[PDB]
Design a protein around this ligand. Structure first.
Ligand SMILES: Nc1ncnc2c1ncn2[C@@H]1O[C@H](CSCC[C@H](N)C(=O)O)[C@@H](O)[C@H]1O
Lengths: 93, 84, 321, 76, 107, 98, 107, 93, 84, 98
DNA sequence: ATCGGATGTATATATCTGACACGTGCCTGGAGACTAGGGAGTAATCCCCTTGGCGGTTAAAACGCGGGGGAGAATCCGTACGTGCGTTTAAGCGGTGCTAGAGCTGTCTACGACCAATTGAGCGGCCTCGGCACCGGGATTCTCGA
DNA sequence: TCGAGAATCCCGGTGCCGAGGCCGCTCAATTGGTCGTAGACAGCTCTAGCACCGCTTAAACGCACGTACGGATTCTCCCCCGCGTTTTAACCGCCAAGGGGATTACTCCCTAGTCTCCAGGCACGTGTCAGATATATACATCCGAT
């Protein structure tokens, strides 16, 4: 049964940000569970931000406000910048 | 025209922090408490107001609602009953 | 009535009304004439050699006749040492370079004689002290062939500081808000006339109004090399558009700023090539580290330098194993 | 014929070229021989900012001559 | 049509297809706007990049070329902002930051 | 000789009084001006509903009297009876806020 | 076809129709069983019954016949398990429990 | 417009458990928010329970397990007894 | 057959609690810390195991699997990375 | 005269040993018997995946490590160095668990 | 203070090993290309309610002064806890064996979304009084210096 | 080993404004169907968890001993409390302005949905290198002797 994971994607971001090093399987499943946990946090805050304003969509702006709430300070500024950079690179394609 | 309040944290006066501390049940309060409690209250209000203003500015509003402060407190795990 | 003292060299004479100028918390006209007289005293040794004569503590702000007596003493002195200058005796040459506290209170003199109401500056910006850019001058080493520019000069005080203190060919200053640029063109003209009054040398410089992201200003900053900003509250879009503007700078160009565009633990790798952190070396200074008026803890105004060799050795280190 | 590629940090690499091929092909060979990205590099010679669809002879740079290398941030 | 993956349009390494499927089949809201999974995958890929960069630094400082969980704990407990985001969490086989109180070392 | 309570029992009388009543302790307009002064930094020209600064005040007094309960337990733990900044910083370092 | 309400079918007071509509429209799952809102409105009615009983006792001890918020705070703090359920919340205009620590009363 | 509340149902349960006692408007809003918060906790744990097994429905089993998880001890026993009594009283009729 | 365990809370030894406190940064340990920490560990394991056993009683299973313990700890706030 | 270390430095060598290392500091099989004893009270004849015992172990010992950090801060606050059961009870009362 | 003996820990090298790293079918999930509907953007308009500004009152805040009591410092005692050491013990490893149960798959039926028609539950708005807020003053219970 | 000033409490008395009951009126709950599918269940498979054995040895237990430290004690200074006078800003009440929230109408773009293709990623298999372990010897240091 295909138990999907974020193994290969965390691996690709590792081979980008560190071209030498690799990641052991326990630390592989730690970053798997971390990506799952930040996903569930941001999607939970986006769901509550969509329900609190009587909307019915998770648009890009709700994920931006979720990242502004959850991540502290400079991580919020950097993740907001990288997110809106990726969404403006996506829409002009 | 325009205005900005220079240093307005001293409105949480020394008898106010004294009354709050007497509510919690302290018997005697050292004199260096009051600066520390003004700092603690400033950090707590900065966190709740930062999340409340984010919840508002998401909704395209310019009035911080009472629901926005209630959601900003429910976000940090300090749920507030009485305002919705 | 009036109160006048001419230059120690003989420029257009310094004029003052008999009504009292009161401006700020710390800036009065009596202290102004006191500090100006003392710095004209410290510039020429013969002046404090001649005017030690019998004027002690007993002088007060509003009592104007002792001010008239002392300034008449100084006026007789100025004319008489001009007659001592008219002989074979050589004076101190006008085209020498000034001191540090001399430029400090010459800039505070322009601060006095141009801006009277600074809280009208509140209509929205802060103050940059001159000891900050003084320790920057202690840090930055510069030549004649480069160009100095600060972006968002406000009243333009540091423009006059660099233009009279050090030696770029063309110093700029820019300001977009109407009130401090409004006062800054007058600061430019009055600083020109006070440089005529003191007679100390200063190079080519200007104070302008505009948005420094415009299409002229893009290649204009792509021309220069020395840039100063106070980027605590420019915003995100201003700083990113300025980053992709400073990407077109030559070798050795230097930036000084409050909020650093790249954090000083930067290491470049295949994810953040688009950032300006691949171009700059980031060093840290040590200023007076004050500003307890708003938020300021001990923080330095970090120096970036355009160093396109770290990107080159990264690209050649790509093929190591 | 010969080409010189000057880097701004003061190094040159001498390479085997054809003037008939495009400069996009020789900058691809610059990628294969040094690792410099195609989007990130730009090569100039006497105020002439090159274009990838044009060749070496189309901008009239001759044998044993040098192209200056400078870099721009890629973006998207 | 030449199939270009939606993560490759954005230039992210994290998938936005899988993020879009999880946003739909997790029931966060009824409709999921198309600009949201690319934004969310950019944020996840950024946070993975920051924890992996600090983890690689903490592993190379320990003269190892492989990220062990201890290097992950040494990454996220040293950076104060990742320590605030990951405050509640226990990283397994993680260890503790070596910090002993200065009262205990004898004069 | 005037009548004067010994130092310590007007405090306990204040404790019984402020514990048995439920009104707000900070004056309402200084807290409203403090909330506006802190909200000045995030978005300018923000309006506040009156119940919003009331909710901020109920939350801030409930947080501060819970912190003072914790700091009183710390000050009693150090065999003292006076709360001090060491005590407040200890309660916040234990609850996970510093 | 007599419209007999589901809130009355189960002998509850809480609106099983409204609880069912909130379970559907609130996006908790893609379908909500019929056994769900009867159970949930029963649990809500039981918790409201226990809180209101203890608040009524606490207001009767203060010889008042209107439950004000202070009686709710006395109800949720005097019981142990309602205090464990409501441990995070701050019931506004509620006050604290009256107790002074044993080192502070005079001796 | 119509802003729904649990005001009248809390009022009915108060009239059941204390037939002479009333509830002030601020304590009315506090019990309104308490019912809303307990409903959001139980439905949140029920949605997580129905998702963690790759199910799709909030049955009565999921609400029973959520009430067993959130409320402590004796409240959990009495609440699941009240709930199973009410679901049997519903399904028999 | 079967086995029924009487008490294994004395199996968390005194050197085990010494090693745990040495990880925390504790230099001297009073002699009652061992009994108090056995009590504290028993309370914590009762909470996590009660929630995990409820999570596995719901799924009609009879093995408390690692996802059940991880979900119990994610419920009580102590989120656990490294088990799924 | 045998070589004896002044009481208080094998503790510091133990701290520097265990703080830099990532073992599980409780032995595994006593913890398995403890987890099965505690789980017999809730559902009889349960089984445990081995990863679930390791998850319960890593969680319980990381909670106990953080508790001993808060306890050591409590004991240092009381001008002592020795953690005592009133220090654990204070740390668990400040954290919000009793 | 200075100085070795013993100890511990770090640094260096050779070894095995198994767990990471990468290549292979493959399959299913993601991309793509229409299709329809409603959710959301946008504009316009009503009007609630939020900010800002008078003054009058006065309770509360600020300041200052004795002064007692509590924090802290210094001293002393003994005992409880660290440290080795040797003596016990039970954890760990490394195998084997079983079957219980997780897990996957294959029907299939009950069940819940969906939709339309029907109606009364519950909403806002509005009188209506009574529980409590304020108050006045006296009895009770303190707290303290006698 | 208590009377006296003084808060606090209690009890009767007055007034008010918020709880509390009543009433049209929507519109959301109910009922009655239909249909797609998800969950229940049966059955088979096959991982893996429990159980058991014995060997090894790291670790736990016990124990005596010495010493640092916790706790009690006494003392001393300062500092924070209680009180009284001044003072000031909160607060209440009232006033108007107008900003923006809330609502409705309209319209179209964006996204669910669906059907088809195809390649991205996953389980699996296999080489081989980073690290773990063991050993062997240099540095860091701890601590008692002089
Ligand atoms: N587009 C723009 N062009 C010019 N100035 C700008 C600008 N945007 C902001 N500014 C100015 O940047 C200034 C920041 S304050 C800097 C003060 C001054 N440079 C000094 O060093 O003393 C403000 O005056 C603000 O008006």
């Amino acid at each position: 049964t295909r138990k999907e994971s974020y193994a290969i994607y965390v691996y690709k971001v590792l081979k980008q940000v560190h071209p030498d090093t690799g990641i052991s399987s326990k630390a592989m499943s730690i970053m798997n569970s971390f990506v799952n946990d930040v996903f569930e946090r941001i999607a939970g805050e986006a769901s509550r931000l969509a329900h609190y304003n009587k909307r019915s969509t998770i648009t890009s702006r709700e994920i931006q406000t979720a990242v502004r709430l959850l991540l502290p300070g400079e991580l919020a500024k950097h993740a907001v910048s990288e997110g809106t950079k990726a969404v403006t690179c996506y829409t002009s394609a | 025209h325009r205005k900005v309040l220079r240093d307005n944290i001293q409105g949480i006066t020394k008898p106010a922090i004294r009354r709050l501390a007497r509510r919690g049940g302290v018997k005697r309060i050292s004199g260096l408490i009051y600066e520390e409690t003004r700092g603690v209250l400033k950090v707590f209000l900065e966190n709740v107001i930062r999340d409340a203003v984010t919840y508002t500015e998401h909704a395209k509003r310019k009035t911080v609602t009472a629901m926005d402060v209630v959601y900003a407190l429910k976000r940090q795990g300090r749920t507030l009953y009485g305002f919705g | 009535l009036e109160l006048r003292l001419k230059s120690p060299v003989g420029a257009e004479p310094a004029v003052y009304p008999w009504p009292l100028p009161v401006y700020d918390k710390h800036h009065d006209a009596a202290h102004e004439i006191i500090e100006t007289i003392r710095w004209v005293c410290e510039e020429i040794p013969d002046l404090k050699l001649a005017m030690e004569n019998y004027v002690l503590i007993d002088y007060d702000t509003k009592s104007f006749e002792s001010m008239q007596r002392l300034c008449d003493k100084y006026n007789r002195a100025i004319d008489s040492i001009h007659q001592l200058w008219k002989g074979t005796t050589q004076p101190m040459k006008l085209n020498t370079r000034p001191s540090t506290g001399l430029l400090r209170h010459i800039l505070q003199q322009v601060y006095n004689h141009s801006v009277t109401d600074p809280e009208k500056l509140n209509n929205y910006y802060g103050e940059t002290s001159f000891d900050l850019v003084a320790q920057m001058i202690d840090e930055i080493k510069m030549t004649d062939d480069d160009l100095f520019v600060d972006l968002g000069s406000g009243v333009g005080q540091v423009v006059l500081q660099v233009a009279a203190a050090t030696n770029c060919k063309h110093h700029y200053g820019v300001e977009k808000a109407d009130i401090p640029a409004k006062y800054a063109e007058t600061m430019d003209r009055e600083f020109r006339k006070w440089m005529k009054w003191y007679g100390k040398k200063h190079a080519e410089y200007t104070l302008e109004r505009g948005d420094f992201l415009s299409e002229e200003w893009r290649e204009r900053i792509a021309n220069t090399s020395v840039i100063f900003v106070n980027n605590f509250a420019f915003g995100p879009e201003v700083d990113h558009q300025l980053k992709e503007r400073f990407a077109n700078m030559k070798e050795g160009g230097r930036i000084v700023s409050s909020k650093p565009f790249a954090p000083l633990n930067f290491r470049i790798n295949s994810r953040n090539l688009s950032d300006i952190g691949t171009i700059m070396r980031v060093v840290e200074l040590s200023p007076l580290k004050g500003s307890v008026s708003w938020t300021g803890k001990p923080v330095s105004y970090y120096l970036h330098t355009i160093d396109r060799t770290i990107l080159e050795n990264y690209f050649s280190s790509l093929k190591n194993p | 014929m010969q080409i010189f590629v000057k880097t701004l940090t003061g190094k040159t690499i001498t390479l085997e070229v054809e003037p008939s091929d495009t400069i996009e092909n020789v900058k691809a060979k610059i990628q294969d021989k040094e690792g410099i990205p195609p989007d990130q590099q730009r090569l100039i010679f006497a105020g002439k900012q090159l274009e990838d669809g044009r060749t070496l002879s189309d901008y009239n740079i001759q044998k044993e001559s040098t192209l200056h290398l400078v870099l721009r941030l890629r973006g998207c | 049509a030449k199939a270009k993956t939606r993560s490759s349009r954005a230039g992210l390494q994290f998938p936005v297809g899988r993020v879009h499927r999880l946003l739909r089949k997790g029931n966060y809201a009824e409709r999921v706007g198309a600009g949201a999974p690319v934004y969310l995958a950019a944020v996840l890929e950024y946070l993975t990049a920051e924890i992996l960069e600090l983890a690689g630094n903490a592993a190379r400082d320990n003269k190892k070329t492989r990220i062990i969980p201890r290097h992950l704990q040494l990454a996220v407990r040293n950076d104060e902002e990742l320590n605030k985001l990951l405050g509640r969490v226990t990283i397994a086989q993680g260890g503790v930051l070596p910090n002993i109180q200065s009262v205990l070392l004898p004069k | 000789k005037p009548h004067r309570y010994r130092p310590g029992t007007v405090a306990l009388r204040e404790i019984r009084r402020y514990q048995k009543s439920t009104e707000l302790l900070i004056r309402k307009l200084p807290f409203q001006r403090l909330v506006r002064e802190i909200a000045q930094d995030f978005k300018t020209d923000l309006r506040f509903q009156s119940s919003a600064v009331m909710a901020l005040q109920e939350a801030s007094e409930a947080y501060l009297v819970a912190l003072f309960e914790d700091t009183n337990l710390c000050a009693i733990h150090a065999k003292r009876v006076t709360i001090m900044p060491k005590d407040i910083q200890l309660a916040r370092r234990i609850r996970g806020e510093r």
